[PDB]
Assembly symmetry: C3
Homo-oligomer: 266 residues x 3
């Protein structure tokens, strides 16, 4: 009924043969219900919570995910580290399908989501100049290097509304104009909320395809396919990362861990 590490990804990242106290729980939140029941497990004495953002059978599209419930639920369990795993399209020929990316920045191009837990009467404006948690980013990168997994160490993730994929003119713009490196649909508001909940959050992006600006454009089908072929990789990465996580992130290396001290308008 407690966990310090939260894993938000796809189904199956859950490895039942390496996690000990499995347990499934349902948590009610002031925002309705999470994408699914949360799976609690133990890994080397580390209490972990798995929450597939699309639900177990991938029934919830990006624009319908109850992001507030998911992040709130994790927070209510005591989660401090959140490792978010996401399939992403690449906007540069050197970030190739199969490669991983641990972005350090994002650009929000979503349109009708709920972006914050603060709707009033308490107004807060969290700083997100460096939106991700550096502590978790470097452990993920350290682990990726030891495991020999190709992983770019920086990158700007442009989050679009979806569900449809980008138009070729849009994609040229994301790449040439906004200078984004990778593209997806679920980062925002997940990352905003995790920050406002003062969690140390980082995303591992798995490059599935070149976006549009390429040879044979992105299909929902090729994404699901390349994903499977690299799910095994992230599971290894994931577990190795969890094995190395200190009990709490270092505040000096966590931009959002004290986000609220300076974000409330008083």
């Amino acid at each position: 009924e407690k966990a310090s590490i939260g894993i938000i990804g796809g189904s199956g990242l859950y490895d039942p043969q390496i996690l000990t106290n499995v347990k499934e729980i349902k948590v009610y939140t002031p925002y309705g219900e999470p994408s699914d029941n949360i799976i609690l497990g133990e890994l080397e004495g580390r209490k972990v919570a798995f929450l597939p953002r699309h639900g177990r059978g991938h029934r919830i599209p990006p624009h319908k995910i109850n992001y507030r419930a998911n992040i709130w639920a994790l927070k209510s369990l005591g989660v401090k580290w959140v490792i978010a795993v996401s399939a992403v399209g690449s906007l540069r020929l050197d970030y190739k399908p199969g490669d991983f990316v641990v972005p350090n920045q994002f650009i929000d191009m979503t349109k009708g989501r709920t972006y914050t837990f603060f709707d009033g009467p308490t107004v807060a404006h969290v700083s997100m100049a460096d939106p991700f948690c550096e502590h978790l980013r470097s452990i993920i990168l350290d682990s990726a290097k030891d495991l020999g997994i190709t992983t770019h160490d920086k990158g700007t993730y442009i989050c679009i509304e979806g569900p449809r994929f980008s138009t070729r003119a849009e994609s040229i713009v994301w790449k040439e104009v906004f200078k984004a490196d990778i593209i997806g649909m679920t980062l925002v508001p997940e990352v905003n909320l995790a920050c406002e909940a003062e969690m140390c959050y980082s995303v591992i992006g798995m490059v599935t395809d070149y976006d549009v600006f390429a040879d044979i454009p992105v299909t929902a089908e090729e994404v699901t396919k390349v994903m499977a072929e690299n799910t095994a990789k992230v599971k290894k990465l994931l577990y190795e990362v969890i094995r190395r996580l200190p009990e709490k992130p270092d505040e000096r290396k966590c931009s959002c861990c004290q986000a609220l001290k300076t974000a409330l308008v008083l």
Copy 2:
């Protein structure tokens, strides 16, 4: 007697021409999303069953951001529509696309902000590909017809869709043109085009240039759009009817990017 049409026309009122269409009948259709912008007008043109649906409603009482896009596209699909010719007034972002010229865009950039973008809210998740958002089969027939009629029609273009209803700010417009490199601008394309694609229809818009956006003698006005529009409504109707006369029964799938959109879009 099941009411059917293979061709859908979405534009302004008027396009529909009383005694030009022969077996005209008005119908109201109920959809899982509420009601379409207006009753649909069914008619025949040389044995071609056609459905007209003015997206703003007959008296133009519905603004761009309030259009029930899902109801409109779902209604056309339920009637058996395969081809959808969308006609829209647009502002030009380049001195060579002039008021009076038409444009058949091949791309778009979506800058809208609070509309409903899809028919797929769950539990079936779908991510339709839109690299080439329009139906090439329809675009070329429209261009062929334009050429035969001698109607100036640019054969490509990036349509940037803004939320509106207010028109762009000069700084926005400089960005749409110099940065985004868009060619024409309007407010109703998205999500109409997303939805038509998800409904696996062959869809293409005819943009009627109405004004230069902000860089022009006097900036774009709603009155100016309505003015130049009428002056060219006559041209689109001719174009329109010529296009319909030439349409094959079904679009050629090899030339229709969305005609089989779902086979590959479901997760």
Copy 3:
């Protein structure tokens, strides 16, 4: 007994309002077709000028930017007869020469908000107001003439990029707002306030108070650093504000007011 009236509207933070310079203070509550305004409106007189103060975030700043009832606020001022609307707002800077403590009277904006209500016209009357020059030039020049006479540093032009918030920009977003969109300042409340004021045919202008550089700077913008600096310059805007009000003609000059006759040409017939 006499109906509530004001020709000037001030929308900003609490604090601009002052008991010693506005004479017949009266607090009123106005109901609108959109619900209620961010707070009760404070009516007062300044040199025989009837003024209305409306703090857009509410007196205790309990309403965030994305939750403000912009339609109610604008409609309430309109119903009181307001013709000049001076909007005051804390903003971040996207250029090193626009410094904290400087003021800016923008002449352009770029809307990057995402889920707000942008217009009073949802049908059946469709209207597309022109906004090529979004602000009211008449008010802008009076503000600038007043700033110059008071010796208050005030940039006379600028593109305000409005973001959805409430979280502050990412460093990658800020580089894009600055290098790509070329915006000069950044804030969260301009749109749809400015759209609505224009559609109401009001002569509207914002005085932006630079509070901080945005992420491309010393150490990134914090909510707390905007609170600290704002206060240090609230005194400046109050002087500016009052001097501006002292000079306002009865009605703006339509030839110097892009939105004052906005509806004549915006309705679809």
